[PDB]
């Protein structure tokens, strides 16, 4: 009852290689290099699915800060004022308003400043 190698080996390695399409040279051509690279890609992918959330929050914060400065306020003062005024609009929506609906962002800033004054 001999079980010769068969085709499972080729199938598994081909799956890895297909995962490695687009890599540089041997990193997509050769199974060993491809696998080693695919593992690093998995490591980076898992790590970046977390870093991606940080990056976009950072981006929204920066844009909100610019808009707040134009309206006569710092980012920190704006957020403190919004918390005082009970505004729960998050940073994603705030950044979108700053870029697209400048009037709406200005209205938000006015309420924030009023809460700060009170």
């Amino acid at each position: 009852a001999r079980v010769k190698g068969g085709t499972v080996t080729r199938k598994r390695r081909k799956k890895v290689l297909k995962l490695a399409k687009g890599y540089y040279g041997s990193k997509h051509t050769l199974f060993k290099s491809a696998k080693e690279q695919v593992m690093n890609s998995y490591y980076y992918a898992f790590r970046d699915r977390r870093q991606k959330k940080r990056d976009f929050r950072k981006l929204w914060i920066a844009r909100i800060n610019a808009a707040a400065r134009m309206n006569g306020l710092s980012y920190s003062k704006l957020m403190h004022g919004l918390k005082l005024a009970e505004i729960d609009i998050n940073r994603k929506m705030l950044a979108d308003l700053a870029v697209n609906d400048a009037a709406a962002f200005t209205a938000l800033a006015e309420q924030a400043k009023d809460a700060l004054s009170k």
């Binding site: 976009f56 981006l59 920066a62």
Partner: protein, 147 residues
């Protein structure tokens, strides 16, 4: 939803500002200038796209150096030859080549990448109060409160 706005190259209008360096500490002038050049002052800021505005610095010769920086702050550079170290004091740079002084200060503050170098090109420094870029219709950018 993946709706965050991303600026495109060339869609953003870049204005021109004039910054007067008279009696402004070198570093503080440079910091505000670098933010403007990067575009941190505009809501459309997009890290992977250049969106900042152009800066014309005038009166570079009158930039302020607090403390004894005029004689103790030393700019080094190595020619990459053995014993090829050269130095020049910040005061000497201000007297002779003030453009270099401001440019080095702002290079240090911009990112060290292709985008950062491109943004640096948008800076123009002139010792004295007159610049050749009237054709661009630059507008004065007060920084008294920004520093």
């Amino acid at each position: 939803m993946r709706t965050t706005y991303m600026a495109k190259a060339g869609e953003v209008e870049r204005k021109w500002y004039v910054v007067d360096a008279t009696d402004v500490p070198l570093g503080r002038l440079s910091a505000v200038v670098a933010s403007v050049l990067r575009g941190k002052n505009k809501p459309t800021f997009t890290p992977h796209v250049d969106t900042g505005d152009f800066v014309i610095v005038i009166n570079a010769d009158k930039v302020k150096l607090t403390g004894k920086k005029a004689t103790d702050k030393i700019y080094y550079r190595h020619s990459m030859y053995p014993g090829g170290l050269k130095s020049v004091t910040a005061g000497e740079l201000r007297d002779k080549n003030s453009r270099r002084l401001i440019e080095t200060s702002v290079k240090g503050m911009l990112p060290k990448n292709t985008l950062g170098r491109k943004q640096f090109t948008k800076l123009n420094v002139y010792g004295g109060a007159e610049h050749p870029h009237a054709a661009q219709q630059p507008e004065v950018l007060d920084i008294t409160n920004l520093i």
